Amino acid sequence: PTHEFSLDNGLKVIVREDHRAPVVVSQLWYRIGSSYETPGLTGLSHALEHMMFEENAFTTDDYTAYYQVLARDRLPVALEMEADRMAHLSLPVDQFKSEIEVIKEERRLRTDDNPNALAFERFKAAAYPASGYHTPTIGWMADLQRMTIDDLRHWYESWYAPNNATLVVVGDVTADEVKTLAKRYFGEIPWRQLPPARKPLELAEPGERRLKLYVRTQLPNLIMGFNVPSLGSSENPREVNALRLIGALLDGGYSARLASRLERGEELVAGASTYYDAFNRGDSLFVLSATPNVQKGKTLEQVEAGLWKQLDDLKQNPPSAAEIERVRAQMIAGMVYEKDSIAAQASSIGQLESVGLSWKLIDQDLEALKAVTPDDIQKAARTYFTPSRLTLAQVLPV
Amino acid sequence: PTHEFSLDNGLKVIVREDHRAPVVVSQLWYRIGSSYETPGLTGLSHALEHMMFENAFTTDDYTAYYQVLARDRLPVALEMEADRMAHLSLPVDQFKSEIEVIKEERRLRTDDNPNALAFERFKAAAYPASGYHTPTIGWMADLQRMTIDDLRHWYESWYAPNNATLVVVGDVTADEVKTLAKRYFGEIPWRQLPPARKPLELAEPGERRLKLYVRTQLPNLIMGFNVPSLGSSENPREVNALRLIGALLDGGYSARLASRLERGEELVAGASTYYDAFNRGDSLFVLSATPNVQKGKTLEQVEAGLWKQLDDLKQNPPSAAEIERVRAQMIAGMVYEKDSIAAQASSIGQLESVGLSWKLIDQDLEALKAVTPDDIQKAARTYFTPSRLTLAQVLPV
């Protein structure tokens, strides 16, 4: 029940009908992000978004999205005002001067004065030496401090264009109905030449980077990241999917390895997690987080020793399909759960599409996960969990 | 004997008259460098320079074109430069081979020169938030995706007259030059530039430590501390003091590292210091050293050794006596260093490129001499901290 058409101006439109309730979701996804940004002018995408402002907006490394959820008959007015945004930017000098302070202020409160946020910003910069991924989305303070109205306008001109955008609609509508409105509201808007956009590729083996940061935190903790591919950047999708599965094996659940082995069973860590986004425009990071079992006086150095042991085990011993399946199934199940929810489907469509991946993937994703074999997993672990790919940071209390 | 004027297109001209010999230096400086480059599009400034072809250099902050000429030659050289400013002329075919050359040059010079490769990685860690993290040559992946259209745009953007400085030094006169600069350059119109932002780094990025395994066979150590430069600094004095600290540590055969560590303790095979105080943005004070492996030394001991020397500076300032000896020697090095007209004129071009007046050239020596011993201690304390440090261990494979 999903249709794809593109307007003359290069706007791509995706529509999925779901008549279960009389509501429709409209999201607009622009392919501009912090990874496109240039030093001394960081934070631009996020500011620009903030300035053109249920409905919400979000800016990440690879995209900026505006979405609204609404009553089916009100779709025409939702589309009209998203089109307005695309069409022109009304931003007064007076408005700007006030907003920039808010943003700067937001940087202090939520990044600088948030010790975990702070540490992560640093970790991320060290982890991504060559790619745009190193840049903080909020922007460096020095950059915000120097940002100007003209810089914002120009950014708007350059990137907020129909051929840089995807409109996604799901809900109680007809694809023809949507098609008609888009032309009506967006059709007018002309195509604009874009700046060059390059996937944010990173070195495969940057070397071993270790960070020590003292922050206003009460609990010492360890962050380990491994430079890796994503579907945006990978000629072998199998290895990526193998990586996703590895995270699930480590972090998802009571019986998952880190919990049973390190939290219980050894008492090395208080908690431990993993995060890996497989759906980047470019390359990605496989991340580990643990905090030490302070009660037993366990050091960060011990935690790290413990994590490597678990990573080694994967290299040495392919996990059983009995393990993989339990782990795979639950991943699918959780993913399926999101399926329902027109908003989630819309976001899945917009995310992937902003990143150079087709929406057609979602359907085949569950087949793809299925293809992973215990061998794939072992192979990916051997390949990627090398010290040459590691950024490790100790976040310590001062 | 030095005069500056600007043409109405905003090109700035500085002429310095020296008549000892009928030779003249002509240099053209553009304010564009690798520090300006966007991710995924690194290498552009360097690549462009490659295409313009007596000589040229691209760095973080600038691109310079320079010749040394007989005076009669000067009109022709100015013509060729004006031509380069005005009309790109960049055929596709030419791009295709040249990019290939540059890529190979990266493979060889940066990928099989183990130290160059290591320094590049070290630099990227040293500069989390500023443009200086980017290698001038460019990352290989950016190189592979570069297009002729990308180059033309860089040229349209940055190689404008109002972004350039023309420096002429030698047996010429300000008037003649003004006449020539008008003839060749005057018609090239002013263009609106993209925004330029100084490459300001974080003050305290945090302690970062690197381990790289490379194709060398001697292990070495690199220590970088994030610091200010004249481009970025409110207190110029602290910068000048850092310069002296550099002189003190590795200024000469008799300087502290050589005397104490190379000889002395015999900790190091060699030890060096680097600090560029004339950057658009912030900068790095750099130490590099090799272990005494005959004596079975390790990188860990070498580190402790360097750290000990840094601390002594902190703990108590150097005698006013050392300060002269080290200083005087530094200056003699500088005086030997002005002399040339080429150097004498690139000193101007570099300064104008990073946002600083040429009038500094004269002003410098006085400035070192005004650094007090207390200035040195305060600087060592302020700056030589683990929170400013990025440390690399460079090991053989």
The secondary structure of B74-110 as a DSSP string is: HHHHHHHHHHHHH-----HHHHHHHHHHHHHHIIIII
Among the listed residues B321, B335, B336, B323, the one whose alpha carbon sits nearest the alpha carbon of residue B243 = B323
Q: Contact B124/A129, CB-based, under 8 Å?
A: yes
Q: Kindly report the CA angle at B381 between B375 and B383, in degrees rounded to 5? A: 100
Question: ∠ CA B214-A233-B123 to the nearest 5 degrees?
Answer: 35
A58 contacts A350 by C-beta, under 8 angstroms = no
CA A362, CA B293: separation in Å to the nearest integer? 58
Nearest residue of B to residue A40 by CA position? B197
**Residue showing tokens 């908003």:** A343
**Dist. CA A317–CA A106, nearest whole Å:** 47
Closest by CA position to B353, among listed B192, B164, B85, B130: B164
Cβ separation of A209 and B125 shorter than 8 Å?
yes
Contacts of A394 in chain B (CB under 8 A): none
Q: Which residues pair with B2 in a beta bridge?
A: B16
CATH fold of A201-398, please? Cytochrome Bc1 Complex; Chain A, domain 1 (3.30.830)
Are the CB atoms for A139 and A107 separated by under 8 Å?
A: yes
Q: Dihedral of CA B194/B197/B198/B199: which sign? A: negative
Residues in B touching A391 (Cβ below 8 Å): none
Task: Look at phi and psi of residue B296 and say left if phi exceeds 0, alpha if psi is from -120 to 50, else beta.
Answer: left
**Quick check: A65 and A350 in contact, CB under 8 A?**
yes
CA distance B86 to chain A (A): 23
Q: A300 CA to chain B: closest CA distance, Å?
A: 16
Query: B1-199: what fold?
Result: Cytochrome Bc1 Complex; Chain A, domain 1 (3.30.830)
Whether the Cβ atoms of residue B168 and residue B15 lie closer than 8 Å to each other: yes
Residue bearing tokens 């708007």: A156
C-beta neighbour count of B41 within 10 angstroms: 23
- What stretch of H or E contains B227? strand B220-227
Q: Which CATH number fits domain A1-200: 3.40.50.1980, 3.30.830.10, 2.60.120.10, 3.50.50.60?
A: 3.30.830.10
Q: Which residue of A has its CA nearest to B38?
A: A38
Cα of B215 to nearest chain A Cα, Å:
14
Residue contact B206–A197, C-beta within 8 A: no
| Most A-contacting residue of B136, B209, B299, B390 (CB-CB within 10 A), to test interface | B209
**A20 touches A191 (CB < 8 A):** no
User: Please, are residues B383 and B227 in contact by the beta-carbon 8 Å criterion?
Assistant: yes
Q: Is the dihedral of CA B134, B138, B144, B147 positive or negative?
A: positive
Picking from A146, A153, A194, A211 by the largest number of B CB atoms within 10 A of its own CB, the best residue to mutate is A211
Task: Say which DSSP state A264 is in.
Answer: S
Q: Is B131–A39 a contact, with Cβ atoms under 8 angstroms apart?
A: yes
User: Could you give the 3-state DSSP secondary structure of residue A123?
Assistant: helix
Quick count: other Cβ atoms within 10 Å of Cβ A394?
21
CB pairs under 8 A between A and B: 111
With contact defined as beta carbons under 8 Å apart, do B205 and B226 qualify? yes
Q: Do A130 and B124 touch (CB under 8 A)?
A: yes
| Cβ contacts of A36 on chain B, cutoff 8 Å | 38-39
Structural contact between residues A222 and A393, judged by C-beta atoms closer than 8 angstroms: yes
CA-nearest residue of chain A to B196? A40
Interface of B with A (CB under 8 A): 35-42, 121, 124-125, 128-131, 133-134, 139, 141-142, 145, 147, 149-150, 195-200, 202, 205-213, 386-387
A9, A162, A358, B361 from A165: Cα distances, Å: 10, 5, 14, 52
Tokens of B78: 């100015």
Asked if B250 and B286 count as a contact pair (C-beta separation under 8 A), the reply is: no
Q: List, in sequence order, every residue forming a beta bridge with A15; answer none if it has no partner.
A: A3, A169
Q: Which amino acid is at B6?
A: S
Partners of residue A388 in chain B, C-beta under 8 Å: 213
Hey, are the CB atoms on B211 and A387 less than 8 Å from each other? yes
Determine, for residues B208 and A126 on separate chains, whether the beta-carbon distance falls below 8 Å.
yes
Interchain proximity B206–A203, CB inside 8 Å: no
d(CA A145, CA A94): 17
Specify the DSSP element, H or E, that contains B240: helix B236-250
Q: H helices of chain A, where?
A: 44-51, 75-87, 93-107, 115-127, 141-146, 149-159, 175-186, 237-251, 257, 300-316, 321-339, 342-354, 361-371, 374-384
| Residue of chain A whose Cα is closest to the Cα of B121 | A206
Domain range B200-397, CATH architecture: 2-Layer Sandwich (3.30)
B205/chain A closest Cα distance in angstroms: 7
Torsion, Cα A126 A130 A133 A137, to 10 degrees, reads: 80
Cβ atoms within 10 A of the Cβ of B104, count?
A: 11
Contact B41 A196 (CB under 8 A): yes
Calpha distance A40→B130 (Å, rounded) = 7
Give the minimum alpha-carbon distance from A140 to chain B in angstroms, rounded to a whole number.
7
Interface-testing mutation among B121, B140, B143, with chain A (most A C-beta atoms within 10 A): B121
Start-end ranges of CATH 3.30.830.10 in chain A? 1-200, 201-398
Q: What is the dihedral of CA A350, A273, B122, B57, to 10 degrees?
A: 0
Contact B38 A35 (CB under 8 A): no
Strand partners of residue A394: A212, A222
In A, minimum Cα distance to B197 occurs at A40
CA angle B114, B115, B116 (to 5 degrees): 95
CA-CA distance, A255 to A263, in Å (whole number)? Answer: 11
Q: Judge: B147–A196 Cβ closer than 8 Å, yes or no.
A: yes
**Interface contact B38-A36, CB threshold 8 A:** yes
Q: Where in chain B is the domain with CATH 3.30.830.10?
A: 1-199, 200-397
**Tell me, what DSSP letter sits at residue B350?**
H
Number of residues that make up chain A: 398
- Rounded to whole angstroms, the Cα distance separating B316 from A174 reads 80
Each residue of A62-83: b (16+ CB within 10 Å) or e?
bbbbbbbbbeeeebeebbeebb
Does B41 contact A213 at a Cβ distance shorter than 8 Å? no
